[PDB]
Amino acid sequence: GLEERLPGGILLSTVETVAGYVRKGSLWPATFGLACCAIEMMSTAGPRFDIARFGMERFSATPRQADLMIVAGRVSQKMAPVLRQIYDQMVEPKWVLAMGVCASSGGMFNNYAVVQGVDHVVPVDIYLPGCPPRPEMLLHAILKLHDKIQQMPLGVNREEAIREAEQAALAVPPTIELKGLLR
Amino acid sequence: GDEPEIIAVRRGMFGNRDTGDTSGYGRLVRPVALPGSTPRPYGGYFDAVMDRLAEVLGEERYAMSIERVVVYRDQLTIEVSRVQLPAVASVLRDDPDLRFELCLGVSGVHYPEDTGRELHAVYPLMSITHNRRIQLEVAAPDADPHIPSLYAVYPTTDWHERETYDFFGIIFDGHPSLTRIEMPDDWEGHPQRKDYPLGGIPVEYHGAQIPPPDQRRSY
Amino acid sequence: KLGPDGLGNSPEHIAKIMGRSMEGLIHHFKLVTEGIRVPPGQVYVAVESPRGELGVHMVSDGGTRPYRVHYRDPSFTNLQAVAATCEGGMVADAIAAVASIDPVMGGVDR
Amino acid sequence: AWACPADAIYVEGADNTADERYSPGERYGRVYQINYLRCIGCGLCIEACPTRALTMTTEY
Amino acid sequence: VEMVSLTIDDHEISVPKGTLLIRAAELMGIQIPRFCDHPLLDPVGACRQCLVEVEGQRKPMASCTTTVMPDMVVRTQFTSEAADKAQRGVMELLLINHPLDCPICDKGGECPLQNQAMSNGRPETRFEDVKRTFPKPISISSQVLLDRERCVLCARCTRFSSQIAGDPFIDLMERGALQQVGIGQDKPFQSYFSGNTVQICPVGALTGTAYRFRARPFDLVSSPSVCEHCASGCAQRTDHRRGKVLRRLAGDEPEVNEEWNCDKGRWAFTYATVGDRITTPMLRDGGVLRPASWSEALTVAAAGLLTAAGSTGVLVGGRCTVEDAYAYAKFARMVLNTNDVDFRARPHSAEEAEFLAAHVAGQTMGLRYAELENAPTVLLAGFEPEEESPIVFLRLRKGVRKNGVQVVAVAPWASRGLTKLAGTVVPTVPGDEPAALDGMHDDDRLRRPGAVILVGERLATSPGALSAAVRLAAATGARLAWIPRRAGERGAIEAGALPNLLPGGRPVDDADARAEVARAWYISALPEAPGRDTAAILSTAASGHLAALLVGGVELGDLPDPELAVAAVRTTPFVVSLELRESAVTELADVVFPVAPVVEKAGSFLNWEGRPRPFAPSLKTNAIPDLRVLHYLADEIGVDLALPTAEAADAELAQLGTWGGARPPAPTAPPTARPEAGSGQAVLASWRMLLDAGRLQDGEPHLAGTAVRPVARMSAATAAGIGASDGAPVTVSTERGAVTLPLAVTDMPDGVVWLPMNSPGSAVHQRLGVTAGAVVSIGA
Amino acid sequence: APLRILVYSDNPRTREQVRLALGKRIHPELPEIEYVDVATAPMAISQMDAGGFDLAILDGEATPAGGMGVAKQVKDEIDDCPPILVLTGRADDAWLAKWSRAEAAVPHPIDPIRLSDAVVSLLR
Ligand SMILES: CC(C)=CCC/C(C)=C/CC/C(C)=C/CC/C(C)=C/CC/C(C)=C\CC/C(C)=C/CC/C(C)=C/CC/C(C)=C\CC/C(C)=C/CC1=C(C)C(=O)c2ccccc2C1=O
Ligand SMILES: Nc1nc2c(ncn2[C@@H]2O[C@H](COP(=O)(O)OP(=O)(O)OP(=O)(O)O)[C@@H](O)[C@H]2O)c(=O)[nH]1
Ligand code: SF4
Ligand code: SF4
Ligand code: SF4
Ligand code: SF4
Ligand code: SF4
Numbered sequence A: 001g002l003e004e005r006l007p008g009g010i011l012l013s014t015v016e017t018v019a020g021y022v023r024k025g026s027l028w029p030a031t032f033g034l035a036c037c038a039i040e041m042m043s044t045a046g047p048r049f050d051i052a053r054f055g056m057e058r059f060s061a062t063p064r065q066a067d068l069m070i071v072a073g074r075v076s077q078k079m080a081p082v083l084r085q086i087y088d089q090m091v092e093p094k095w096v097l098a099m100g101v102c103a104s105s106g107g108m109f110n111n112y113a114v115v116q117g118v119d120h121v122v123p124v125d126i127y128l129p130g131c132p133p134r135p136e137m138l139l140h141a142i143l144k145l146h147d148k149i150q151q152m153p154l155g156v157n158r159e160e161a162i163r164e165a166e167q168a169a170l171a172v173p174p175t176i177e178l179k180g181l182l183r
Numbered sequence B: 001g002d003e004p005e006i007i008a009v010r011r012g013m014f015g016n017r018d019t020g021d022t023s024g025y026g027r028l029v030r031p032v033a034l035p036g037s038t039p040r041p042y043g044g045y046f047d048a049v050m051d052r053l054a055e056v057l058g059e060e061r062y063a064m065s066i067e068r069v070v071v072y073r074d075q076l077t078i079e080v081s082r083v084q085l086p087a088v089a090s091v092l093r094d095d096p097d098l099r100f101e102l103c104l105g106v107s108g109v110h111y112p113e114d115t116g117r118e119l120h121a122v123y124p125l126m127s128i129t130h131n132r133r134i135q136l137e138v139a140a141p142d143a144d145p146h147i148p149s150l151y152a153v154y155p156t157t158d159w160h161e162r163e164t165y166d167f168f169g170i171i172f173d174g175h176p177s178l179t180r181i182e183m184p185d186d187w188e189g190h191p192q193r194k195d196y197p198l199g200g201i202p203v204e205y206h207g208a209q210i211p212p213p214d215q216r217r218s219y
Numbered sequence C: 001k002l003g004p005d006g007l008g009n010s011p012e013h014i015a016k017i018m019g020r021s022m023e024g025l026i027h028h029f030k031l032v033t034e035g036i037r038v039p040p041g042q043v044y045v046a047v048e049s050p051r052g053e054l055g056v057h058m059v060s061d062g063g064t065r066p067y068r069v070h071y072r073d074p075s076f077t078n079l080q081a082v083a084a085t086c087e088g089g090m091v092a093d094a095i096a097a098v099a100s101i102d103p104v105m106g107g108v109d110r
Numbered sequence D: 001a002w003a004c005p006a007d008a009i010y011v012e013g014a015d016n017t018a019d020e021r022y023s024p025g026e027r028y029g030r031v032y033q034i035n036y037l038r039c040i041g042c043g044l045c046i047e048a049c050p051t052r053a054l055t056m057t058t059e060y
Numbered sequence E: 001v002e003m004v005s006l007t008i009d010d011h012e013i014s015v016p017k018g019t020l021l022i023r024a025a026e027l028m029g030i031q032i033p034r035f036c037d038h039p040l041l042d043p044v045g046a047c048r049q050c051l052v053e054v055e056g057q058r059k060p061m062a063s064c065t066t067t068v069m070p071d072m073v074v075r076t077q078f079t080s081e082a083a084d085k086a087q088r089g090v091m092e093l094l095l096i097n098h099p100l101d102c103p104i105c106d107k108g109g110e111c112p113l114q115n116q117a118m119s120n121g122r123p124e125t126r127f128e129d130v131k132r133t134f135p136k137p138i139s140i141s142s143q144v145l146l147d148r149e150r151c152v153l154c155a156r157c158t159r160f161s162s163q164i165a166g167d168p169f170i171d172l173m174e175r176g177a178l179q180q181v182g183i184g185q186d187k188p189f190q191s192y193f194s195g196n197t198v199q200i201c202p203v204g205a206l207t208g209t210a211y212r213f214r215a216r217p218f219d220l221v222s223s224p225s226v227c228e229h230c231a232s233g234c235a236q237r238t239d240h241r242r243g244k245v246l247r248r249l250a251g252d253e254p255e256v257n258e259e260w261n262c263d264k265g266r267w268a269f270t271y272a273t274v275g276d277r278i279t280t281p282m283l284r285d286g287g288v289l290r291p292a293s294w295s296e297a298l299t300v301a302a303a304g305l306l307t308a309a310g311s312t313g314v315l316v317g318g319r320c321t322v323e324d325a326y327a328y329a330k331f332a333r334m335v336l337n338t339n340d341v342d343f344r345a346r347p348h349s350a351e352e353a354e355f356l357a358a359h360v361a362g363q364t365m366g367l368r369y370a371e372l373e374n375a376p377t378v379l380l381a382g383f384e385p386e387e388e389s390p391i392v393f394l395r396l397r398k399g400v401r402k403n404g405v406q407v408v409a410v411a412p413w414a415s416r417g418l419t420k421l422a423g424t425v426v427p428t429v430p431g432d433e434p435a436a437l438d439g440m441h442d443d444d445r446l447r448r449p450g451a452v453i454l455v456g457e458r459l460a461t462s463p464g465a466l467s468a469a470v471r472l473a474a475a476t477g478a479r480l481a482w483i484p485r486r487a488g489e490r491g492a493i494e495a496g497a498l499p500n501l502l503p504g505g506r507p508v509d510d511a512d513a514r515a516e517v518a519r520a521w522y523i524s525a526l527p528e529a530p531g532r533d534t535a536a537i538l539s540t541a542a543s544g545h546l547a548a549l550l551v552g553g554v555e556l557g558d559l560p561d562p563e564l565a566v567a568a569v570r571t572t573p574f575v576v577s578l579e580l581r582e583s584a585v586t587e588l589a590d591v592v593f594p595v596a597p598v599v600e601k602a603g604s605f606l607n608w609e610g611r612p613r614p615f616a617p618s619l620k621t622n623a624i625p626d627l628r629v630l631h632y633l634a635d636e637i638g639v640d641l642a643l644p645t646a647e648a649a650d651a652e653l654a655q656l657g658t659w660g661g662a663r664p665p666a667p668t669a670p671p672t673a674r675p676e677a678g679s680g681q682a683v684l685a686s687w688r689m690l691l692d693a694g695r696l697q698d699g700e701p702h703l704a705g706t707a708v709r710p711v712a713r714m715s716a717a718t719a720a721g722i723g724a725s726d727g728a729p730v731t732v733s734t735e736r737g738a739v740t741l742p743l744a745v746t747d748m749p750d751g752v753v754w755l756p757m758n759s760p761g762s763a764v765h766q767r768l769g770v771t772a773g774a775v776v777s778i779g780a
Numbered sequence F: 001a002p003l004r005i006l007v008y009s010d011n012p013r014t015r016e017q018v019r020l021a022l023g024k025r026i027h028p029e030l031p032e033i034e035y036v037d038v039a040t041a042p043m044a045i046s047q048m049d050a051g052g053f054d055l056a057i058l059d060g061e062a063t064p065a066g067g068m069g070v071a072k073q074v075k076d077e078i079d080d081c082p083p084i085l086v087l088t089g090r091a092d093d094a095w096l097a098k099w100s101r102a103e104a105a106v107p108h109p110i111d112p113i114r115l116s117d118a119v120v121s122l123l124r
């Protein structure tokens, strides 16, 4: 979009700041509960809390309007195609929140039936522990996603950030090699 | 035969599935027998049920159809013979004295170590009018996993029979369409079978990983 | 038991099994790690879940792990009624019917 | 870690010695990791622990 | 098979005369609690845990010691309330002094004490008094840590170390409540079978120092396996956590190893992770060995091997599964069109190959461990069972204790292993063995039916020895077996990995055999030229007449002339090495391929008796076996080796089947005259100690620290003739170099000095470059 | 011309393993192989958008975005997309590898010859 073709000076910086503000303040979820965590997501929207406070009252039913995907449940094998279809049918920019141990890494259900993390099928912006994560934890994760969104580059800055992140990522030793005091 | 069904034969003490972690303890041979047929005076209404069944069926038909009767923990299991299942189920549902209207489903259970009887389908039946309940059990081999479907007698079974097939491969012949219900149609294998691996992945940790529970030791 | 450092084993139990009671220690260790081993056998037990007769077929092979645990979840069987309660009606009415069934899909798919 | 249904705890024990002692007794947990993307918060770990070394806070 | 019938509890059974009540109750499905009992140990009835009520008996009787009499009636804790009370009281008394150590005890989770206190114990303590206490742990060796408080004093460790192994270096000591298993003062436990005690202890009293605090049972991936180390082929159980092997328990295979190991098999598993492992294919460039891709490496190896064509020899080594040896042999036959194949990475001879073709190859499952136990007379030629195939020693000792097996050893001196067998030495200087065998044709002990003659691999080194042994076996009628020292030797022979042999034992010189293998290989015809032994191959390559070598898992230091072998590999223009670890060959080779170790590959060994010992890959890894490496090297070369996996190799070996035709002729080699050593010189005798400096024992300092201290050995006459005294460092020497070890004056033939073949500081081949039986100078 | 292969994985060791299975010249009857390594989904996507790749190897186990998801995305988003090979961390993942529409799937741990043969089949 033209908003990203601005020169890398103050115009682009301020546009990035305002766009990040707006996108963090209007982060409509998709009406895409899966399991236990879906019930806790409804509880988060419920009056005891108020997800609407964060501009997130509109659980968008159509993927087109939804800017955020709270996976919030366990992605079976037969659901991964559907979950990916819904993700791809949101219009960019879009972020994905792996709510719960099931969504983030497969959780306790380390089995054939479960994909072991939606990361397998869709990029994950934030991982959220819990089984289910209580609504306060969901709000915490959503606020961390707000922080991620606000500090978001655009245009030439987006390309520079992708290059920097790629270079940094190539160096991290894999988790299996971080042998500490483990003999 | 009245000898029990041995679903497994434990070798050694402490439930070792293999040689064992201490020497000299592996020589025990403990077969894992399910309860054998109850002698005769079945507790409570069970006799009242079975006798009635034996009345509605003939002596010859009853003997050919009912392979075993097992009362365990005040629960009545009728190990029915394959092939004869639809007739027995029809008798149970229709007979006013039995009138087991509600079949609650079908559950497959796999006993690879039970020769010729590897796959057991369990039918929990309940009679609301008589406030009774029993469990039919039909055993089929692995090489011929075909069982007669009860659809004409219990439509509720249609999905259960499907899931049980999907999960065990028990072919309910005569079922309208035994399509997989839970797993994708292109899925290979029947997960609830013991032969099917758990299909987990190692859990990651900084500098290590834990293999799934099916790989690590057990007792 | 709770304490200033959070929920944990009650310090009385820790004292019992780590300072005094050897049989207590063995029982804690084995019941926590291996767990009880159930006598072999089958049993179908039902409860009146909010959505209907939630049945459980349980099979034990004499071991510390269950041999079989099959849930006859009421929601799974109730969903056989989508055809009956939706066919012929309006789609808006089909939504109401499906809601009335109150299917919780976790139990349906297990 | 034994009791965890999710295999969410990884523990490696090591010897306490005079030159370096971390716990009373002969053993201590040199490595202690919890994979919180596998932990289901069940609490079985706590009930399993025989020293009350493991507790559950209310921090979430 | 007199069967006695008795009722245990209510039920009835019939069992062999002499069977113990505990065994019968096992057979009928009844778990009588037991600690001190052991099926393979003579009953002791010490712990009194296994008490049962027996009809007509006032006292409870230890079921582990009560021989079954006809018509007896017995009621266990399942039906006798009195027996239940007895067992539960014994359990309580067993736990009062026991430490509250379960969280910190390694045996936790696998403890028979825990399990039987659950099944047969009181819910909680009744003991409010003070527990007995010992300072713990205390090492009884470099490997074994003793925790006396946890010791239930069952004596199973002591009873094993006396009955099963002749190693009573621990015993029950002190008295009364203070009784404790202990070593003498500081003399370490020091037994090649010490690990068995760790596996035999029903509690955490004896633990492996290597395995200490490493893991709990639930954290272990456990797999069946076979030991890699000698031809005994013991069933073992490999346990690995975090992808690292943590221990190798003895498993259970009554037809092979009962429930026993040696320390080598039990603990020598770290070799694959000592940091010298070859992780990626390596290529020689600019004289430096560089990491390389598989594609590039195979390209280069195929180029070199095709350039060398039939001017190549394949050294298969003895560290190969039967499938791996078969692939090496088939690769040599077709892919290289050569017969220069030899798995012998050791002292060896042409007479050895002739004998192996004549009597061993193709003759599976003849003499068996069970037969050993009942052989009235066992003769040993060039074979130290304790040092070579320790489980053969265990079976021979079992036969000695049970069936009066009489053992005879043609050896220079009574080895500790032989003494534990109550065996009789036939003192003879190395090389003079054929005379000993020829002097035994009239021996009445061998004429007894079921007599056995075990020939060690070292017997090949002596000219005329193997033919002499074959003559003796034929003349006396005793069954003759040949027991190598490496697990892959017998599998290699069955794989036709000798210059004169093809798979199934059929000889290369037989045209019909060549046709059978060519058909089974869907190929025109195998090479007809006689192959070159390993010594021939090495001497040829050192001459520059060899165009390339394919060395699979061979340590040159083990060859008779290691200097010659290093020269041979260096001068060879193109050397392709399939090695698990960096070595002399890998250092000097041009292309290096990594091959998966035994823990991470499927396959099978053959033990000396010919019994197959198959195993699945316990570890799953990107690594590939020698099978796939050779198969894909051949594919790049453009020939279908048709061995994508061990399963295919097994299928092909089954297809080729046994030869069944005209068995190859016997060796019949002439017994050449032995050299005579003058003053200041003696004939060298040696054999590899079990716990020597072998490459596969690397990375396990405890096991090494449990090795027997290397020593030279001499007759007091010969030590005096050299002017040495017991304990003084005697030096033997030859042109290559010298070996210096403390002198241990030994009852043995004069003019003979015995050194460990490859013990630390000995390395007789590397240091001296001579085989056993060679003349070597001596001095103070 | 040299073939460019995009190897995607955030695990450096898996990338090195793939680069080992495939030499600079796999199947010497084939052109030289050039490796561009990427450890992030956005970079992998951008490199694909640049185009000119003969094959892309996507680690199905990539942490922040699996190689199967990236495979489906690249097939949905790049016209004339190059054939995709996937490394699957589980045998049961095969079905998802089928759904990812990758021309082939190689289970972990990377078997060198299997991966080389798969690649040669795709790049031929
Ligand atoms: C010096 C001085 C005084 C200068 C003043 C200059 C000035 C400020 C100018 C004023 C005049 C203007 C604005 C002229 C500029 C040109 C102009 C008009 C541009 C328009 C551009 C455009 C088309 C769009 C950009 C945004 C914009 C400002 C548009 C007009 C305003 C609005 C509000 C438009 C769209 C937003 C809207 C009405 C709906 C968004 C969608 C939804 C679903 C809304 C939120 C929402 C709804 C509605 C639910 O139903 C709901 C129910 C239950 C739970 C949650 C929700 C929920 O979240
Ligand atoms: N190709 C191949 N090499 C192996 C294999 N296993 C071990 N090796 C290598 O073979 C080399 C020689 O092994 P050995 O001849 O048994 O030497 P050792 O370990 O001292 O054993 P001993 O002969 O009993 O002394 C070692 O350096 C290992 O790296 C294998 O399975 N395949
Ligand atoms: S992570 Fe736990 S709470 Fe969330 S859906 Fe899965 S099982 Fe339910
Ligand atoms: S709460 Fe504790 S026991 Fe439960 S899953 Fe998490 S770490 Fe394991
Ligand atoms: S030996 Fe057994 S009972 Fe004693 S502390 Fe160890 S695990 Fe517990
Ligand atoms: S150390 Fe073990 S085997 Fe030896 S007496 Fe004590 S408990 Fe028995
Ligand atoms: S005797 Fe040989 S095969 Fe048996 S465990 Fe010991 S080293 Fe291994």
Ligand code: FES
Binding pocket: E033, E034, E035, E036, E037, E044, E045, E046, E047, E048, E049, E050, E051, E062, E063, E064, E065
């Ligand atoms: S087992 Fe019989 S007295 Fe110990």
